[PDB]
Amino acid sequence: LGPLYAIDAPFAVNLVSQNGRRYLKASISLELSNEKLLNEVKVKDTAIKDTIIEILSSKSVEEVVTNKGKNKLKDEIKSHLNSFLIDGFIKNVFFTDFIIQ
């Protein structure tokens, strides 16, 4: 395992839904490939939240309720975030809390 970076503020977004108004509450942690990436993912904290909000809020309930959905989601998050990081890459995305209200 490499350095863990908890995005302390949980994410709360709307999900795309036919049935009225549905929400996602979700706490995210990133596994960093090396220790130097720590400093960069703090400096770029704001862009990471923005990217994640845009990705999360583009999903329907059906696209995130299964475990295949959540894993596609974790891959979309990690590969967009990696596109603008240069001192390393996110190896993994973990949810420490994930609920649809």
Q: Are 58 and 66 in contact (CB under 8 A)?
A: no
Q: Are 7 and 65 in contact (CB under 8 A)?
A: no
* All structural domains of the chain with their residue ranges: 4-100
Structure-block tokens of residue 51: 């990217």
Compute φ and ψ for 91, nearest 5 degrees: -85, -35
Q: Which CATH architecture has domain 4-100?
A: 2-Layer Sandwich (3.30)
Contacts for 33-37 with beta carbons within 8 Å, 24 or more apart? 33/2, 33/88, 33/89, 33/90, 33/91, 34/2, 34/3, 34/87, 34/88, 35/2, 35/3, 36/87, 36/88, 37/3, 37/85, 37/87, 37/88, 37/89
**CA dist list (Å): 66 to 19, 43, 63, 95:** 18, 33, 7, 14
Q: Are strands 22-32 and 11-15 parallel, antiparallel or unpaired?
A: antiparallel
Residues 53, 33: Cα–Cα separation, whole Å: 23
Q: Are 91 and 31 in contact (CB under 8 A)?
A: yes
- Run of H or E including 51: helix 45-56
